[PDB]
Design a protein around this nucleic acid. Sequence first.
DNA 1: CATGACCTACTGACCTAG
DNA 2: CTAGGTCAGTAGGTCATG
Lengths: 71, 83
Amino acid sequence: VIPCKICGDKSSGIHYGVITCEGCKGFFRRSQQCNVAYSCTRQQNCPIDRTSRNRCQHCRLQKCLALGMSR
Amino acid sequence: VIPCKICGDKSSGIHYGVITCEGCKGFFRRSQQCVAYSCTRQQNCPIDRTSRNRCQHCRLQKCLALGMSRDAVKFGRMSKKQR
DNA sequence: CATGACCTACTGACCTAG
DNA sequence: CTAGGTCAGTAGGTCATG
Ligand SMILES: [Zn+2]
Ligand SMILES: [Zn+2]
Ligand SMILES: [Zn+2]
Ligand SMILES: [Zn+2]
């Protein structure tokens, strides 16, 4: 009904300040527990949709942080 | 327990959207990384466990024909609505 | 060289404590 | 209602072998 702000999949609620799906919510929580560092093999700006969200963890985390997800 | 849709070997899960063995899974990924594959026959070779490496064109051909694609990837367990 | 068995490093549907 | 935890799940790296 309401799409995830990060990837556009079916959202499940407001998680860490942003309407996200369960995948982006779990992905972001795991990134903030270890203080992750990802690197983009491409142009530092890869489209984050439902099927591409796992192809760059750097740009997925970047989308989460830019739209205000915080713990 | 489910035979590989490409070659009939024991599959190890759903890879790029298709139930495949470890061999066809790694073969498809390498084919997309790169790519040239030519068939010395009529582009119709049977793909089974013993013959899967004899013609790479017909192996990748079968991979794509069954829908193997980086867009068909799905992680996690399967949903209640899929049982 | 390419192949594929094996292992790592994750992914996300589902549930409960709060 | 939503963190957080669980565990059934997979991409992809390795490298001895084909
Ligand atoms: Zn999402
Ligand atoms: Zn990227
Ligand atoms: Zn196979
Ligand atoms: Zn052939």
